[PDB]
Swiss-Prot record, chains A, B:
Name of the protein described by the UniProt record: Flagellar L-ring protein
Localization of this protein: Cell outer membrane; Bacterial flagellum basal body
Function as written in the Swiss-Prot or TrEMBL entry: Assembles around the rod to form the L-ring and probably protects the motor/basal body from shearing forces during rotation.
Transmembrane segments: none
Similarity annotation: Belongs to the FlgH family.
Subunit details: The basal body constitutes a major portion of the flagellar organelle and consists of four rings (L,P,S, and M) mounted on a central rod.
Coiled coil: none
Amino acid sequence: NYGYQPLFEDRRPRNIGDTLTIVLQENVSASKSSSANASRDGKTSFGFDTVPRYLQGL
Amino acid sequence: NYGYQPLFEDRRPRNIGDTLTIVLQENVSASKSSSANASRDGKTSFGFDTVPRYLQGL
């Protein structure tokens, strides 16, 4: 005797020793990315090509 | 005598010595991959091409 068995219920595992089908379908995907930047450019100039007389000493 | 045999039930193995057909159809495929990266670039410069007199000592 295997005990009471439901008639219309779907066949499910209920006790120790019962079998069950596992459909292994795994799809995992993780990603991450980052960046940082900094820039600085500086140019400066001053030139006196021709200096008038009253400015010579300066 | 081979005992009671159901008339309309599908022919299934029931006792020791009964035969059963196994259709071997296995298709298993697993995969994994990963990566990591890191980068760092740094450039710095300072130049005094022409130094005025009052700045010379510095």
